[PDB]
Design an enzyme around this catalytic site. Structure first.
Site, PDB file in Angstrom:
ATOM      1  CG  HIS A   1     -36.537  12.649  -3.762  1.00  8.90           C
ATOM      2  ND1 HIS A   1     -36.434  11.624  -2.846  1.00  8.90           N
ATOM      3  CD2 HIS A   1     -36.225  13.784  -3.090  1.00  8.90           C
ATOM      4  CE1 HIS A   1     -36.076  12.117  -1.674  1.00  8.90           C
ATOM      5  NE2 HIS A   1     -35.940  13.425  -1.796  1.00  8.90           N
TER       6      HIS A   1
ATOM      7  CG  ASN B   1     -35.696  11.719   2.690  1.00  4.42           C
ATOM      8  OD1 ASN B   1     -36.279  11.487   1.631  1.00  4.42           O
ATOM      9  ND2 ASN B   1     -35.118  12.894   2.945  1.00  4.42           N
TER      10      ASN B   1
END
Ligand code: HEM
Ligand code: HEM
Ligand code: HEM
Ligand SMILES: [O]
Lengths: 679, 323, 681
Positions: free
Chosen positions: B65, B138
């Protein structure tokens, strides 16, 4: 094998059982749990040793030039150059020295696209038998600024805005052009970055430069001023901006994959090392000060003298261990080379040593395999994080009776020691100033622009037009125009149109019409077309694929990499239309019969985006590539308004198209397809 | 202002003279030199303290990420949810709690494109009056693998090949589809990643998910199994792949810029925080195991209950220090 | 040579010219200057690469056990022990495994004294052919606390006060005894640290303990509970506190010099590895829970069974690269060994891995030469700071078609993988409690005190007396008294005297049981090799010739002899100015040297006033064998020592040598230390 010395640190895992990092075989696909559907136990040492190493995989990216890639190779000296330098790696004809080279952009972070517009790094390490010698260079012979204390200002202004970190890998924003116009020294390198040097076709098609004037010094201390040059044996080649933009999205790895494939396919790239040599008394003889890194020396005054050739023929085995970890320094200097009082070089020597402490968080980074010299390390340094050696000499100090004088001092006369040039003197007041000799920021930008072809010039102006159009602040745009007007009134006029700003009145102080050789890209055809890429657009219907295969096999005979494209991966197909883009190829040719995918039913298929075959041919044409069609496929050229009349457009039977496309790849870019202001 | 507590560390340099980092006013556009055309002196402390800080600016990017952007906001509870949780930030109607949210891709490095096809992160911090509570979610309700010990395997396979570090920010290479085919649990998230969830129009047009079953606990210890959902008030929207590819080159900052623009324009995005609540004895009653993060609970079996609303209405002042 | 594998990383600079760290010969004794008396130039790359490496030499000391020293060696198994463990290093008679061992104190920072009073570390790494197995032990068999989450509280309380960082390397302050009295589980280890175990004579004269119950597991998965023991073949031996204190100032490196000297002189120390073995169904059958690390298992219930022997015979070449950088972990476990649900050991597994990230500032510390296994590392780990290898396998993940399944999974039946004990189960509610079986905090402290000799017990009481008298807070001292009273009313009474507090019995945990193997002074040493004799002599007259013959005969018995005199005449090893009784295990006055104990010879510019009398006085008062040859009898007289006292030897050279060597076996003569009640009228 350039990587020979790295064999002893290589780890083979074939046929082996999984272990921890402290040995002992394990399985590591299941966490240890307290019951069938239970919680994971702290005592699972297997899980934590595996995840801890994962959790800590990353190291900080390089503060500049974060995006890049590299390869190993060999440098061969063409002669015994002891008459100009004591440097051991240049000391005999056919002497070979292993190298590693890392190419890069500058502004973007680790994951940014190769085809951003930017200055490019070109950094070479010679693992000489008298220590590592780095030429930490760029693909452009001049730098933005004249004093190293200004580098954070340049870099801050070019890198993303600090409130939102926008934009990535780009100078096309307010802060950068505010700096360019507020610090006019930057205008020379900016022009080079606005030229083809900002969007090179590949690392293999770049020239390289040390930028700074250094010193070569003989055994007796006599010195010459020197500029380092790398001359690509592949020729210089550039994209056009509208093509680089799409390529950035379609393949951000375009350059690193290009270098990888060239080496893997046995087409190792090569550069000759060349020097300009200037006597000390001519440091200010050529209209500027050779201590000034915003100027280059026209080759009319000092020709490039070839000393040897470098070939890059070994890819790394682990990118992180080798390419990411290598630590370049301009202070990696060896006997027979010295510095000059170039104020930009001076601060670099401090910055590169210091920055390794951040990137490697420890003082022992020169012990990493990719940083180790091959010549041997003998000193009284000890300890530090990650100390990888065990020293025998317990008298780690000098002078000393107990170590018998070892390790011993080396200087100019004994032990082949490094020595500063004997004649260099200091004189004058301690000052926080720059010499008045540095004050001309406009003449050489004008000289560079003068020495490009008309459409090459138009590429520079269209780059500036694109970039400055992103500047929201009106006054900065007028500041940019005021500065460009000091280089050329016609450049300022042509840029002003895009900005909706008035053409300023001529400021002739620095105008001139002189030209110089060796700075243009598009005025010379390529010396070879080996490794250039041909996209063959075909179709699975009919007999087109058999013809495409025959076309492919002939093109490959000339060393081209040929991709046959169709709707799906039938026998002989290298790529689907869905995955294909014109940015990947240096020439596009339509195989006979494939005109069926350029109109009607064959152009509308669930297996690729609507219009994709027409878009590939349109793109390839509009970006100046050789484009072609065999036989009936000429209809594909007609469907996009292109005529065989045109330069770089080929039709007819197979052998005629092959010969034409191959000739066109030498030309590489057909600038007839790009409009010039008032043409 | 959601950023109210951060003002005492804000530094204003307007109207001031340049200083070193230990105070004292300075000039710092010329190195100290020994003579007019001379070498730079080691005693130029101004130079070295300025360049040392620049030399040490970078910190390691997140291991996953790494590419993302964020903003501050406010969460407002719709009710006193004390019958299902003792959590302070849900303990009263209209109670407000500061938040910060970071959105992201997963595979790409710091400077990779926003419109790469990928799972997207949706990480929310509630700065509650009883500690920081993070929902690290997510934009897809299921994950690739069933046991955390396999995360380095998944991530290694999707990230670039370790010999040449190709390809950037992409599942479209040999090692990733080797792993997806060798570890079949991966196929659910894969299908989500291959749908519009993989190429969203913006961060504001994504839903969010905690993925895991958690527990809500009351004062006296009663528990329910819970799934967290963020429901975008802007509506879900996605691109098409051939467009996302060009956008990756035309504006790598597309999602970054879109979030910044919406907040600065006064068009702050919002999400509703919603939950599915399951009795403990039904953990295995819906055709799968609620401990398995490769499955989601269809809403026909347990509809969403809306707990409150989050609005992101303040951009950071310094990206590095904050995001 | 146990260091054999380290020879590939050793760097020889003899006969070489100086270089930078990136190669190239240099001179580095003058900075580059702009003119004759000018400023130093930034382009002096030689200066900066030199001083940068110096400026970054230090790494964080260990968070505990910062002070210590170590050596390489060999472990030899005495048999094929596969009937009890699948551990490879225990799998064959006469099988040899390289070891490294580090000894240490606990509380003091890197440069504190060896002879502080403290628990002592005893950490062994076995570089087995199935990975590194570490036994991270102490010289005391019980630890202060029962749950690892309490470790920062213990350590904060015995380390210096956080406002002024006072006192260094000592439990004798308010916060430590506040914790000992507030957390009574600590009382057992406290008694051990207040005994001879707290001030050992040397690392070579300590026993070692894994403390925790572990598990041995066979190939078929059957397990047994185990306690690890190291039994010193040199014998246990301890100082007295008033001597340890002076030694901390006179030679802070006393213990690390001891080990280094013993190894260099060819007197490598040895320990035997011994185990106690307990059936799984008897974990709670010996009056305590074997998961409780505050308890030891009496040898009368389970005797020691020797498995092999470890001998430490090679000093390091570079202390920093080897001793300072080595990273022990109780998680360094191998096939055939497994953990137990001991809540102290449980948290240790997390903490030693984690702390390496602080000390080495990166996750690749197992690649350091001293930490590398000899058995081979093959996994999908990549990158990390300071990555020292170049991995060939580009498919760094599992499962995988492309890498053909390699590196492959190993478990109980395939690849000799590690496996958790198959029969282990979890049962009950997740809890933040401790088992009530851990509740007894006083019985075994009383058992330990009961098992020491009367003067040994007085050493314990006198250590508490000294320590608690430093506690400024009145209530803390009374809290300490109440807790001590729960172990022994007499102990509390005798401590109370020193503190001026009032002496009532609290008999819940009182008892009279004893157990063997915890005393130090109830047994004489099995060898006097490497023990030190200071021969006090003089440079006037014939004393030196006699001292040399005395030294010669003593050295034949393996003793290290130092002849001392006013200056470094021929045959003198050390001056009186440089000598102190703490350095020696016995003090002998050579004949004729009685002239430096009174009158003119005792007042000299070459040494502090009274120094020879002080060395002899210290030696006697600290329990050492003391002696005088011939007319040197007068030196004993001048300090008021009689010729026929225990451990005092007078006469001719031959009888003195014989008497001194016999007294070294006894080592300390405990009739010279008063016991409570001795002074009564
Ligand atoms: C003629 C001017 C310059 C040239 C040709 C140049 C070239 C380069 C190149 C090629 C790299 C990348 C090396 C690699 O691939 O690892 C690099 C990195 C770097 N540059 Fe420069 N640069 C110049 C000016 C400067 C200045 C003035 C400074 C600061 C005073 C500076 C500081 C740095 C730093 C800190 C790095 C990172 C090095 C690392 O992390 O290993 N550069 N430069
Ligand atoms: C339900 C499954 C998962 C979800 C929803 C998830 C989500 C996220 C998100 C949103 C971030 C970025 C937060 C930010 O913006 O800073 C992140 C980062 C991270 N994730 Fe995950 N992830 C999952 C699985 C895993 C697993 C199984 C592991 C390892 C056992 C893991 C380890 C990490 C790490 C180490 C980071 C870096 C965080 C940092 O540097 O601050 N993730 N994850
Ligand atoms: C029976 C109980 C214990 C014993 C026998 C013991 C023994 C040791 C020894 C001998 C060392 C030094 C090893 C060397 O010489 O390098 C050490 C260090 C250390 N101990 Fe313990 N200890 C115990 C309890 C604990 C606990 C409960 C914790 C934390 C939960 C802990 C944390 C540490 C740490 C962090 C280090 C530093 C390791 C390093 O920096 O490499 N210890 N211990
Ligand atoms: O740079």
């Amino acid at each position: 094998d350039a990587r020979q010395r790295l064999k002893e640190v290589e780890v083979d895992d074939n046929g082996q059982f999984m272990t921890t990092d402290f040995g002992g075989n394990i399985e590591e696909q299941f966490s240890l749990k307290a019951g069938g559907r239970g919680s994971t136990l702290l005592e699972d040492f297997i899980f934590r040793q595996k995840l801890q190493h994962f959790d800590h995989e990353r190291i900080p990216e390089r503060v500049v030039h974060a995006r890049g890639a590299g390869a190993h190779g060999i440098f061969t000296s063409y002669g015994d150059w002891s008459n100009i330098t004591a440097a051991s790696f240049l000391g005999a004809k056919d002497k070979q020295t292993p190298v590693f080279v890392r190419f890069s952009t500058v502004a973007g972070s680790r994951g940014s696209a190769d085809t951003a517009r930017d200055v490019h790094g070109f950094a070479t390490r010679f693992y000489t038998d008298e220590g590592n010698f780095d030429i930490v260079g760029n693909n452009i012979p001049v730098f933005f600024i004249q004093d190293a204390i200004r580098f954070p200002d340049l870099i801050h202004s070019v890198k993303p805005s600090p409130d939102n970190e926008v934009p990535q890998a780009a100078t096309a924003h307010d802060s950068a052009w505010d700096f360019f116009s507020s610090q006019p020294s930057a205008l020379h390198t900016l022009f080079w970055a606005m030229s083809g040097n900002g969007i090179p076709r590949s690392y293999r098609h770049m020239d390289g430069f040390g930028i700074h004037t250094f010193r070569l010094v003989t055994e007796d201390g006599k010195s010459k001023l020197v500029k380092w040059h790398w001359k690509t044996k592949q020729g210089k080649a550039a994209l056009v901006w509208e093509e680089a933009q799409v390529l950035a999205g379609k393949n951000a790895d375009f350059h690193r994959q290009d270098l990888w494939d060239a080496i893997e396919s046995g087409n190792a790239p090569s550069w000759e090392l060349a020097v300009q040599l200037i006597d000390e008394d001519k440091a200010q003889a050529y209209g500027f000060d050779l201590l000034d890194p915003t100027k280059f020396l026209p080759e009319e005054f000092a020709p490039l003298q070839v000393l040897g050739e470098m070939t890059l023929n070994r890819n790394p085995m682990n990118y992180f261990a080798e390419t990411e970890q290598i630590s370049f320094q301009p202070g990696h200097i060896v006997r027979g080379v010295d510095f000059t009082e170039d104020p930009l070089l001076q601060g670099r020597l401090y910055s590169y040593l210091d920055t390794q402490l951040n990137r490697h968080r420890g003082p022992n980074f020169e012990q990493l395999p990719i940083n180790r010299p091959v010549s041997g390390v003998h000193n009284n340094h000890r300890d530090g994080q990650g100390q990888a050696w065990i020293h025998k000499n317990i008298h780690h100090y000098s002078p000393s009776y107990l170590n018998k004088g070892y390790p011993a001092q080396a200087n100019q006369t004994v032990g082949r020691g490094f020595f500063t040039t004997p004649g260099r003197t200091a004189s004058g007041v301690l000052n926080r100033e720059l010499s008045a000799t540095f004050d001309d920021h406009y003449t050489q930008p004008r000289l560079f622009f003068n020495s490009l072809t008309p459409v090459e010039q138009q590429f520079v102006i269209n780059a500036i037009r694109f970039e400055a159009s992103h500047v929201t602040n009106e006054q900065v745009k007028k500041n940019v125009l005021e500065q460009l007007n000091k280089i050329s009134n016609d450049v300022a006029k042509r840029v002003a149109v895009a900005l909706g700003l008035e053409a300023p009145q001529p400021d002739p102080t620095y105008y001139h019409n002189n030209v110089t050789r060796g700075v243009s890209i598009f005025n010379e055809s390529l010396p070879t077309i080996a490794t250039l890429r041909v996209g063959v657009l075909s179709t699975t219907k009919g007999g087109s694929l058999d013809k495409a295969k025959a076309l492919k096999e002939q093109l490959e005979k000339d060393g081209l990499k040929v991709t046959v494209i169709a709707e799906y991966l039938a026998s002989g197909v290298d790529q689907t239309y869905s995955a294909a883009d014109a940015t990947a190829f240096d020439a596009v040719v339509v195989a006979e019969g494939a005109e069926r995918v350029f109109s009607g039913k064959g152009a509308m298929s669930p297996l690729f985006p609507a219009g994709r075959p027409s878009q590939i041919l349109t793109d390839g044409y509009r970006w100046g590539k050789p484009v072609a069609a065999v036989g009936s496929a000429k209809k594909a050229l007609q469907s996009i308004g292109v005529e065989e009349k045109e330069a770089g457009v080929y039709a007819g039977a197979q052998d005629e198209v092959i010969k034409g496309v191959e000739e066109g790849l030498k030309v590489f870019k057909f600038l007839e397809r790009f409009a010039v202001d008032g043409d």
